[PDB]
Amino acid sequence: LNKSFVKKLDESLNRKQVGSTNVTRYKIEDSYLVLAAVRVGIGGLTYHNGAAHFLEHLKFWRYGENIYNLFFQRGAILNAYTTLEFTDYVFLSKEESINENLNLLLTFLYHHQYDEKTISLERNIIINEINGIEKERHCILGSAESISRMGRKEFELISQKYYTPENTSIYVIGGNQDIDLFHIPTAVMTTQYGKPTHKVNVNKDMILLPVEHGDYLKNRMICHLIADMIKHLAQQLEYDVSVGLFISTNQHSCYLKVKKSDQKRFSSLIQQLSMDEHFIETYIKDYQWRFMNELVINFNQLHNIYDYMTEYRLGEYTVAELFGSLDSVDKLDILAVRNELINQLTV
Amino acid sequence: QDPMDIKINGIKKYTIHVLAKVSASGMEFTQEKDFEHQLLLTDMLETVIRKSVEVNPVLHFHLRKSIIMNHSYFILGLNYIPPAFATKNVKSIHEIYQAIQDVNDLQLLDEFEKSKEKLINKIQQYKHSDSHSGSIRLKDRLFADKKYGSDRLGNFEKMNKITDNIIYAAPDMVNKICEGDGLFYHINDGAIHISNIKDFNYYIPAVINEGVEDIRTDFSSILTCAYTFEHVTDLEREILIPMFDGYIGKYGHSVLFKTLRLVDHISSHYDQESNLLFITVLNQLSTILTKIQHTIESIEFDSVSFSLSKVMFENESRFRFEDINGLLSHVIKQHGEYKNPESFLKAIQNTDIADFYRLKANMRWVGTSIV
CATH class of the missing domain: 3.30.830.10 (Metalloenzyme, LuxS/M16 peptidase-like)
Incomplete structure (x- = not known):
C-alpha cells in the first residue's frame, strides 16, 4: 500500500x-x-x-x-x-x-x-x-x-x-x-578551478534564528513544523508577526526570519508551544499527513518535483529516506529546538 | 451501470485518481433568477462536505457551480490516492452522495457568514481590476446585460442582501447535485473514462451595442479595445483564435509589441465565453488607438512564424495537460474528439495559415474603453 x-x-x-x-x-x-x-x-x-x-x-x-x-x-x-x-x-x-x-x-x-x-x-x-x-x-x-x-x-x-x-x-x-x-x-567543459568552497556572506532590523537538531532532512521538517505552529498560534491570538524562512540547499541548518520589532510576540509564542502537552504531538501527526498528501499531489507537476529536489536534495536522498526523516520527528525534537530558540532570543 | 465507458488511452499516469460529475443546468446563467443564492449555498455545501469527505484516501474534494460557455453546471470532484497505494479504499459515488445528504443544517449556518464574505470579496476583486475592468465595462455595454460582465460572479447588491433563511433552499440544491442527470469522468491508470456521449451546446452572447465608446473621466491612463469574429467554429474558438491572440500580443516579439515599441505594458486576451478579443495598453493613448486599429486592420501572417505559434500553443496545451486538474477541465469543456488531448494536439499541428486569413476576414472591431 x-x-x-x-x-x-x-x-x-x-x-x-x-x-x-x-x-x-x-x-x-x-x-x-x-x-x-x-x-x-x-x-x-x-x-x-x-x-x-x-x-x-x-x-x-x-x-x-x-x-x-x-x-x-x-x-x-x-x-x-x-x-x-x-x-x-x-x-x-x-x-x-x-x-x-x-x-x-x-x-x-x-x-x-x-x-x-x-x-x-x-x-x-x-x-x-x-x-x-x-x-x-x-x-x-x-x-x-x-x-x-x-x-x-x-x-x-x-x-x-x-x-x-x-x-x-x-x-x-x-x-x-x-x-x-x-x-x-x-x-x-571544466576550467582550472574546482568546486568553490561554500562561503556564505549573510548580512539589521531582523533576526535569524537557527533550526539545527538532527540531520539535513530533519532540520527542514522541524523548521516547517515550528513555523506552522507559530503562525497558527499567532492567528488565534491575532499576533501580527511575519515568520520568514531561510532554507537553502547548501545549508545544513534551517533558519526562521522574524522582524526585530515582532520579537517579543514571537518569543511569547515559542514559550507558548510547550504549554499544551498534546498540541505538539497532534500537530506533528497532522503535519506528517499533510506533508504526504502534498507530496502525492505535487509529484504530478514538474516544477513542484523540482522544488523537492532543491529543498530536500531528492535524488541524493530517496523518497523513503524523506518519509523516514518525517516519521522520526517527535515532540522531543520540537522541545529541543524550542529551548535553543529561547536561548537565542534570550541573548 | 453507466450507459457507456468511453476510455481515452495514452493519458499521462498521475499519482492520484479523479472521479468527477458534471450536472447540467440547461437554462443560461443569465436566466437563473436565484443565481446569487445558488452560488452561496454551493460554497456553504462544499465547505461542510469537505470536512467530512477530505479524509484519507481523499486528498481534495471539489464542489462548485461553474459557468461553461454561458451555462451553469454543478461540478463535483474527488481526488484520491489509488487503492493500490492507499491504506484505505475510497468511498463510492453512492457514499459520497449519502455524505452530501447527511449534511446538517447547523453546519451550513455556521458557514453562512464566512462563505458570504468569501463570495462578496470575489465579486469586488473581479470588478476592481486595473486592466480587466475595462473589458468588464465593454462586455456590459456590448451585450446590454451586466450578467456577462460585472455580475458574472454575482451581483453585489443581490449577494450582500442575502440572509440565513437561504438554508431552506438547501434541500433543492442537494437534490440537484445528487439526483440531477450528468456525466461522470474518471481518470485512472493512464486513461480517461467518460460515462456517456453528450456535448452541451455552447452559447455565445450576441453583441447588441456595436461600436461602443467608454468615454470615462478619472485621474491617475489605460485603453482597451474589443474585437469579435463571425462564423466562429469549434476549431477557431479553441485553437485558432487562442493562437491568434498569442501571435499578436503574447508570443515574444508580438505584432503589438513591435508596433507600439515605435512610440515607446501591453496585454491581450481572447474571451471564449463572450467571443471577444481584448487588447489592453497602459495623451499618448490617442496615437496608440489609431496605431493599434490600423495594425489590426493591416494584419499579415507567414508560414514560418505561424509554425512557431503552433509549437508554442501546443506546448502551452501540453503544460495544461501536465496538471491533472488542467486535464480534467479540458476533457469536461471540449466537444467531440477535442476531449482527447492527443486529438486536440493533432488538431493544433494540422492548422494552416489559410485558417488565419479566414479569421482575419471575419474579424471586426466592436468597442473601445479608455480611462
Missing part, C-alpha cells in the same frame, strides 16, 4: 555523475513535457554586490548570440533567476529536444568570455531593474554603485571559478530517456 507507493517513486528517481557534473533524474511515463533545470552554485549571498545576478544576464550571450532567442525559435521558453545561493536556468520542452537544448544551454553557461559592450549593456538593463521579498530582490540585484565596481576581469574570473560542471547540478524531470555524456559533451 503506502510502502508500494514510496517504492514506486524511488524506482523512477535516480542520480548519477555525467562527465564532471551530476544529473538528478525523475522519469514520468507519458508525460507531455520534460523539465530541465541547470542550477549553478552561486547566488546573491556569494557576493553582496549583485555579481551573481549580473552573471546571470551575461550568461545569455555567446559570440553575439542570445540563447533566449535561440530557445524561442526552437519553441522553448528559457527562464533564469538568481536566488540567495544558486542561479537557475529552467526550461520545458518535449523530450525529443531535451538533449540538444540542454547541450546548447551548457554551451552558453560554460562560455567564459564577455566583451565590454555586452557588460555595459547588461549593467544598464540591471540598473533599470534596480530603479524599477523586496530586500531579497534588492540584495540579489545589488545596487547601481555595487555593480558599477565590477568589470570584465571580475566577471570572467567568477565565471571560470563558479560556472563549472563540478559546481553545477542538473535536474531532468519527465520522460523516460536517460542523460549521458555522449549526448551532452559539454558536461566535461
Whole structure:
C-alpha cells in the first residue's frame, strides 16, 4: 500500500555523475513535457554586490548570440533567476529536444568570455531593474554603485571559478530517456578551478534564528513544523508577526526570519508551544499527513518535483529516506529546538 | 451501470485518481433568477462536505457551480490516492452522495457568514481590476446585460442582501447535485473514462451595442479595445483564435509589441465565453488607438512564424495537460474528439495559415474603453 507507493517513486528517481557534473533524474511515463533545470552554485549571498545576478544576464550571450532567442525559435521558453545561493536556468520542452537544448544551454553557461559592450549593456538593463521579498530582490540585484565596481576581469574570473560542471547540478524531470555524456559533451567543459568552497556572506532590523537538531532532512521538517505552529498560534491570538524562512540547499541548518520589532510576540509564542502537552504531538501527526498528501499531489507537476529536489536534495536522498526523516520527528525534537530558540532570543 | 465507458488511452499516469460529475443546468446563467443564492449555498455545501469527505484516501474534494460557455453546471470532484497505494479504499459515488445528504443544517449556518464574505470579496476583486475592468465595462455595454460582465460572479447588491433563511433552499440544491442527470469522468491508470456521449451546446452572447465608446473621466491612463469574429467554429474558438491572440500580443516579439515599441505594458486576451478579443495598453493613448486599429486592420501572417505559434500553443496545451486538474477541465469543456488531448494536439499541428486569413476576414472591431 503506502510502502508500494514510496517504492514506486524511488524506482523512477535516480542520480548519477555525467562527465564532471551530476544529473538528478525523475522519469514520468507519458508525460507531455520534460523539465530541465541547470542550477549553478552561486547566488546573491556569494557576493553582496549583485555579481551573481549580473552573471546571470551575461550568461545569455555567446559570440553575439542570445540563447533566449535561440530557445524561442526552437519553441522553448528559457527562464533564469538568481536566488540567495544558486542561479537557475529552467526550461520545458518535449523530450525529443531535451538533449540538444540542454547541450546548447551548457554551451552558453560554460562560455567564459564577455566583451565590454555586452557588460555595459547588461549593467544598464540591471540598473533599470534596480530603479524599477523586496530586500531579497534588492540584495540579489545589488545596487547601481555595487555593480558599477565590477568589470570584465571580475566577471570572467567568477565565471571560470563558479560556472563549472563540478559546481553545477542538473535536474531532468519527465520522460523516460536517460542523460549521458555522449549526448551532452559539454558536461566535461571544466576550467582550472574546482568546486568553490561554500562561503556564505549573510548580512539589521531582523533576526535569524537557527533550526539545527538532527540531520539535513530533519532540520527542514522541524523548521516547517515550528513555523506552522507559530503562525497558527499567532492567528488565534491575532499576533501580527511575519515568520520568514531561510532554507537553502547548501545549508545544513534551517533558519526562521522574524522582524526585530515582532520579537517579543514571537518569543511569547515559542514559550507558548510547550504549554499544551498534546498540541505538539497532534500537530506533528497532522503535519506528517499533510506533508504526504502534498507530496502525492505535487509529484504530478514538474516544477513542484523540482522544488523537492532543491529543498530536500531528492535524488541524493530517496523518497523513503524523506518519509523516514518525517516519521522520526517527535515532540522531543520540537522541545529541543524550542529551548535553543529561547536561548537565542534570550541573548 | 453507466450507459457507456468511453476510455481515452495514452493519458499521462498521475499519482492520484479523479472521479468527477458534471450536472447540467440547461437554462443560461443569465436566466437563473436565484443565481446569487445558488452560488452561496454551493460554497456553504462544499465547505461542510469537505470536512467530512477530505479524509484519507481523499486528498481534495471539489464542489462548485461553474459557468461553461454561458451555462451553469454543478461540478463535483474527488481526488484520491489509488487503492493500490492507499491504506484505505475510497468511498463510492453512492457514499459520497449519502455524505452530501447527511449534511446538517447547523453546519451550513455556521458557514453562512464566512462563505458570504468569501463570495462578496470575489465579486469586488473581479470588478476592481486595473486592466480587466475595462473589458468588464465593454462586455456590459456590448451585450446590454451586466450578467456577462460585472455580475458574472454575482451581483453585489443581490449577494450582500442575502440572509440565513437561504438554508431552506438547501434541500433543492442537494437534490440537484445528487439526483440531477450528468456525466461522470474518471481518470485512472493512464486513461480517461467518460460515462456517456453528450456535448452541451455552447452559447455565445450576441453583441447588441456595436461600436461602443467608454468615454470615462478619472485621474491617475489605460485603453482597451474589443474585437469579435463571425462564423466562429469549434476549431477557431479553441485553437485558432487562442493562437491568434498569442501571435499578436503574447508570443515574444508580438505584432503589438513591435508596433507600439515605435512610440515607446501591453496585454491581450481572447474571451471564449463572450467571443471577444481584448487588447489592453497602459495623451499618448490617442496615437496608440489609431496605431493599434490600423495594425489590426493591416494584419499579415507567414508560414514560418505561424509554425512557431503552433509549437508554442501546443506546448502551452501540453503544460495544461501536465496538471491533472488542467486535464480534467479540458476533457469536461471540449466537444467531440477535442476531449482527447492527443486529438486536440493533432488538431493544433494540422492548422494552416489559410485558417488565419479566414479569421482575419471575419474579424471586426466592436468597442473601445479608455480611462
